[PDB]
Amino acid sequence: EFATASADYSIAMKKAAEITGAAESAMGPKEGGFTAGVPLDTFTRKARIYAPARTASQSGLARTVDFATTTPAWKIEFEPTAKWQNPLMGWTSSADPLENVGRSALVFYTKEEAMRFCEKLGWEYEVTEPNKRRTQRTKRYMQYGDNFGTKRAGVPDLSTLPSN
């Protein structure tokens, strides 16, 4: 039996990505940036390929690499450039064109897909593998019954009993 998110339109998205002839499209390095038509100094900047960790404030795991095959979780991020305050109002000003484009719009299923996008666009990239969660609990409090075990204070000595 096979049932891996088999009740939604994502079935019709996984295929249409493996249609023959279109599943083997490939370009040389930096070639997609030449035909993109954006200024060429944009590709002198550095990019980071990484999957963001779970927020500490909440316990849910949906925006992590646990659901990597279900949901795109890998991101492309750029270093910050200068910001200052507006003299009249105090609003935060910037001259960065890539200020929100990687964090809002570019999401990928795997690390290699984001690498392929960076390679064909000409961005130099560094890849950061996320830290793997550990599921095995401690030896103490491994199960619920270890809360009430004999490991709290040892086996009780029967020396204060009447008739000792």
């Binding site: 204070a153 040892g154 009780p156 000595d157 029967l158 020396s159 204060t160």
Partner: protein, 239 residues
Amino acid sequence: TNSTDIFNIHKDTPENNAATSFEFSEATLKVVNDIIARYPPNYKQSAIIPVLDVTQQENGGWLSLAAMNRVAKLLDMAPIRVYEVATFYTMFNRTKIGKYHVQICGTTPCRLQGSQKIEEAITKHLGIGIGQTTQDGLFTLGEMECMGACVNAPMVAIADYTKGVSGFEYIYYEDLTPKDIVNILDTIKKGGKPKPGSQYRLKAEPAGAVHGGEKWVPKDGETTLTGAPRAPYCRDLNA
């Protein structure tokens, strides 16, 4: 939780603060150390509920912050665990009460028998409601759940704190009318000892009943175990 204790946190009082002192006497310390020996040494914390009860008679019917801290030091446990136990259980008073603690049952088997009229009689006589102490410091009125005396409903329990640990008395008074509880309160106030148990029979044996919460109405009928008691007997355990 009980009556008279609306806070589950400590409130500073000139009578009740961290500067207040508590210490056991010699005989009470003997009692507490005898209680501790009932349990294993590495599980000495099992003794907290009887020790806190004994401390409650020692301190005069209620637990102060100093008494709880002394008990915490005595059993070698953190004070927050002692505060947890003392706030969890209904008998533990954490504010100062009177000399006699009058507790009336209000659960439905006592309620059908007219516990509300007994409460009305107590409030009309003593002049206080539930959760209050008299201006003389004699009586404190409280409400309780089912006390396991339902065949002799309606009933009142009265706790004696005028003699300390050695003369502590927790006495049930059962099968009551307004006249019976008024007489019991007057007998306690005058310095006598009212009779314990039911006011119209000995025990839970078949006899009459309180009709409407105002009048005992005796009724005759079949009674069991009226003859001679059974002799010792055993079958042949071999075969």
